[PDB]
């Protein structure tokens with residue numbers, strides 16, 4: 213359907229500039245393209261930043277960035293954050309404004325997992341790093357000065373996939389305890405022939421061929437994609453029941469729209485308390501992309517997620 | 528699609544023992560059904576309440592209820608509120624919890640218009656009362672101890688129709704200035720054959736025959752229904768341009784969904800900044816009905832609207 217006007221101007225400018233398709237690029241090139249898009253002078257909430265490594269995960273180490281509202285030294289609730297951008301791309305820079313907004317709005321520490329990206333690392337390295345850091349935070353709360361009984365998880369796009377799977381792993385492994393989960397336009401299935409994949413196959417912004425490529429970078433060739441730790445839409449009502457309350461936010465004009473909304477239904481059917489909202493007039497990645505930060509959908513969704521997290525972690 | 532479970536329980540109870548269809552009742556009887564449904568003791572935000580009358584509007588007197596956050600005597604911004612329930616039903620009791628939430632969350636005075644109901648009063652009595660009260664508030668700010676430069680309007684269902692029309696009338700008549708407008712699942716058209724009307728014709732909760740009956744109570748026989756003061760979807764890009772930023776919230780499972788989302792697009796095409804959000808798993812009237820008060824969609828939408836108003840009126 214018809215896009216919000218600032219969002220439309222972005223899409224048209226992108227067409228006019230005529231850049232190479234994402235799946236013709238090397239990982240390094242693809243990374244640099246998104247990094248360059250997100251390198252502008254933009255207003256950002258004030259935070260204190262620490263870059264470090266936790267000695268956990270399948271590789272023995274996971275890079276993290278810890279963010280706190282600037283000057284706040286309280287024992288805060290904590291968000292463990294899993295970023296999107298196709299498994300191949302994304303870093304502390306590309307998602308900086310977004311995760312600063314979440315930290316300050318939630319009034320929480322936020323632990324950004326700088327997981328090993330694809331294709332150099334394939335499934336399941338990142339989800340195991342993600343799970344390991346979440347467990348680490350829960351088990352090292354005095355050192356991080358956080359309250360482990362108020363731990364939320366959150367992520368955008370493939371990072372929403374990671375959020376869902378960490379919830380699933382925490383159920384299976386008996387912890388850690390999760391207070392709430394937030395999923396921005398999550399990847400939850402690999403059915404490239406559903407309604408929204410068919411309708412929006414040629415965009416805007418995200419295309420079916422692009423998703424085909426991202427999935428092929430993430431996964432080993434020939435792996436069974438129906439397994440719930442890959443496509444959590446297939447999780448059993450068992451794996452889902454008992455999970456933390458969820459906020460799921462989708463975009464109207466998005467190949468991934470239908471699977472995110474279907475996943476929200478699956479959670480709800482399993483007895484999970486699910487807040488699920490579709491934003492009209494916007495596109496995939498709309499709370500991360502700096503070019504859309506002043507659009508009404510981006511502002512609304514960030515305010516909604518911030519408030520949802522604040523209530524979950526302080527109410 | 529499938530409803531949130533508590534919401535489905537409500538719908539199941541109606542199908543089991545809901546009785547005669549609302550539109551087969553007298554207006555008195557219909558009024559009493561909703562009044563009874565909403566008169567349960569339930570947790571509500573603390574406010575101060577004043578019931579009075581402003582000597583304006585087509586009848587010479589419009590009943591209003593003025594709500595403030597409890598004990599607050601500050602010169603506050605103000606919301607003028609137009610309630611829903613089919614033009615036939617609704618009063619200060621049916622919408623009590625909802626408008627208390629908005630007052631407290633926006634930290635604003637709220638002026639609830641107890642307009643004359645249909646069919647005893649037809650169009651255009653209520654919209655002229657509604658506009659008159661809005662003008663009155665702008666022009667008697669010292670009497671009411673409010674800031675007239677921070678005046679918002681808001682409404683639900685046919686009250687969303689009223690919000691749209693008051694915006695239009697204010698454009699046409701040169702004021703008063705409106706800072707923001709909030710429309711919960713508005714009535715904007717009378718095309719009973721569109722997509723969502725066809726899909727949800729027999730419910731849940733709101734039905735196509737009910738809407739046909741409500742419209743018939745509201746309107747004189749043979750009136751041209753395409754007048755934008757009746758169906759604001761027909762407003763020109765000129766009646767719309769210049770209007771205040773809008774929040775439009777729709778329900779997934781609702782005959783009125785498509786016309787609400789279409790109206791949002793019409794505003795956006797006219798250059799208005801429109802925040803438009805569809806809540807999945809819920810039904811029409813979901814922010815007013817007390818039985819749904821603790822459901823995720825109701826809590827979410829009320830928090831969203833409350834925060835949107837707070838930002839508009841205090842930012």
Ligand SMILES: [Mg+2]
Pocket residue numbers: 397398461462463464466468469470472
């Ligand atoms: Mg989506």
Ligand SMILES: [Mg+2]
Pocket residue numbers: 712713776777778779781783784785787
């Ligand atoms: Mg609706």
Ligand SMILES: [Mg+2]
Pocket residue numbers: 216492493508509795800801802803
């Ligand atoms: Mg818009």
